[PDB]
Amino acid sequence: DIINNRRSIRNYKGKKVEKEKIEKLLRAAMQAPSAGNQQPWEFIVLEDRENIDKLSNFSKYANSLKTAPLAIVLLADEEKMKISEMWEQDMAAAAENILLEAAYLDLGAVWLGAQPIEERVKNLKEMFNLKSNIKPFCVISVGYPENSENKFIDRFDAKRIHIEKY
Amino acid sequence: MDIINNRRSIRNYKGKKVEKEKIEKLLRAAMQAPSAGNQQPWEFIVLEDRENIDKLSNFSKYANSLKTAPLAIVLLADEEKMKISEMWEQDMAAAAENILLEAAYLDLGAVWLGAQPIEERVKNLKEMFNLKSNIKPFCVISVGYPENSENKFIDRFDAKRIHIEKY
Ligand SMILES: Cc1cc2nc3c(=O)[nH]c(=O)nc-3n(C[C@H](O)[C@H](O)[C@H](O)COP(=O)(O)O)c2cc1C
Numbered sequence: 001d002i003i004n005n006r007r008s009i010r011n012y013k014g015k016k017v018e019k020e021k022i023e024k025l026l027r028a029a030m031q032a033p034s035a036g037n038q039q040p041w042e043f044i045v046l047e048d049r050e051n052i053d054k055l056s057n058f059s060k061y062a063n064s065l066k067t068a069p070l071a072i073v074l075l076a077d078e079e080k081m082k083i084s085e086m087w088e089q090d091m092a093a094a095a096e097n098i099l100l101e102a103a104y105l106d107l108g109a110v111w112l113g114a115q116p117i118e119e120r121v122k123n124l125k126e127m128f129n130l131k132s133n134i135k136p137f138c139v140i141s142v143g144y145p146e147n148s149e150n151k152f153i154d155r156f157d158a159k160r161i162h163i164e165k166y
Numbered sequence: 167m168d169i170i171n172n173r174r175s176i177r178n179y180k181g182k183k184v185e186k187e188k189i190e191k192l193l194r195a196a197m198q199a200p201s202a203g204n205q206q207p208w209e210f211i212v213l214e215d216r217e218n219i220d221k222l223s224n225f226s227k228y229a230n231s232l233k234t235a236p237l238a239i240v241l242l243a244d245e246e247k248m249k250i251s252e253m254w255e256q257d258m259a260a261a262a263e264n265i266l267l268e269a270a271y272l273d274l275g276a277v278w279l280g281a282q283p284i285e286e287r288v289k290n291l292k293e294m295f296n297l298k299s300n301i302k303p304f305c306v307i308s309v310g311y312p313e314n315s316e317n318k319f320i321d322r323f324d325a326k327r328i329h330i331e332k333y
């Protein structure tokens with residue numbers, strides 16, 4: 001169900017995400033596959049609404065943060081990268097696990113892209129005073145959904161399937 | 167439902183073919199992934215020909231799982247579908263993760279075989295399938311019924327990775 005029903009939800013109720021749910025989101029992230037099992041992820045968890053609202057300024061497409069009770073900033077540590085070529089993929093897998101787990105827990109979430117847009121990456125580095133080795137990846141805003149639902153939109157397209165050869 | 171915890175990289179498979187219905191479900195799962203701009207840039211080559219699958223193992227030094235796999239899915243992205251080309255690898259990674267999770271859900275084993283951005287691997291996949299310039303190899307996923315490995319929970323949680331409010 002969660003693969004079909006997971007949606008980008010950008011509008012939230014007032015109430016906080018339970019600490020037990022926050023932990024489950026982070027556990028889900030850390031179960032992602034990673035190149036070389038390098039597990040390069042670090043996470044900043046925000047519940048301070050003043051700071052979440054400020055964080056909404058990191059990009060032009062991050063307005064969901066203005067009502068979010070929770071934000072999770074996904075970062076990768078260069079020093080942990082055995083296979084630096086594929087760190088974005090590791091982080092994307094972790095992000096997708098968070099999104100799916102959020103839907104499982106009846107939460108709404110949306111992936112707010114950062115890497116590799118320089119102005120976004122720079123904003124996140126500055127906002128969190130990040131060391132040179134700590135690379136911003138994305139922000140996930142999370143809350144209980146307002147009006148929007150985790151409901152199935154059927155995106156299947158058989159034209160994307162090539163049998164044996166392109 | 168414990169699929170996020172139990173999904174493992176499975177690199178050795180039984181000879182049993184993956185049922186047509188399960189193949190379709192894997193591809194459906196891929197296509198439900200989020201994507202920047204909703205650009206949905208993905209294309210898939212599905213292989214069940216064992217000679218072609220074995221040949222495909224040569225694309226990388228880390229693709230030996232294909233030598234026993236009854237199914238391979240090559241993930242590709244089309245430049246001409248990209249509205250936000252800066253993020254296409256992320257879209258494709260989300261699709262790959264959906265495949266892997268759906269595989270575990272269906273009692274299958276799978277492993278992500280990285281390609282992009284390793285030039286030799288991408289070049290080998292382009293050549294093997296004679297791809298158009300705009301069709302970019304992303305990865306290969308080998309899939310089958312597990313031989314001597316399991317989808318089981320290896321707990322990778324590390325609380326030191328969690329920073330509260332600030333780094
Ligand atoms: C981007 C990426 C590329 C990967 N490439 C390979 C690969 O080429 N060959 C391989 O055997 N495993 C590959 N893996 C699988 C990882 O080695 C595996 O996820 C890691 O060892 C953790 O084990 P798990 O998947 O069981 O959690 C890749 C994983 C990721 C996310």
Ligand SMILES: Cc1cc2nc3c(=O)[nH]c(=O)nc-3n(C[C@H](O)[C@H](O)[C@H](O)COP(=O)(O)O)c2cc1C
Pocket residue numbers: 006007008009010059061062110111112113198199200201202203204253256257260
């Ligand atoms: C790499 C990536 C970056 C994204 N960046 C943003 C973003 O900055 N702001 C936003 O509102 N949504 C963002 N999204 C969410 C997409 O717009 C969304 O996945 C797409 O419209 C499909 O809708 P769905 O998630 O409901 O399936 C991003 C998604 C991906 C995978």
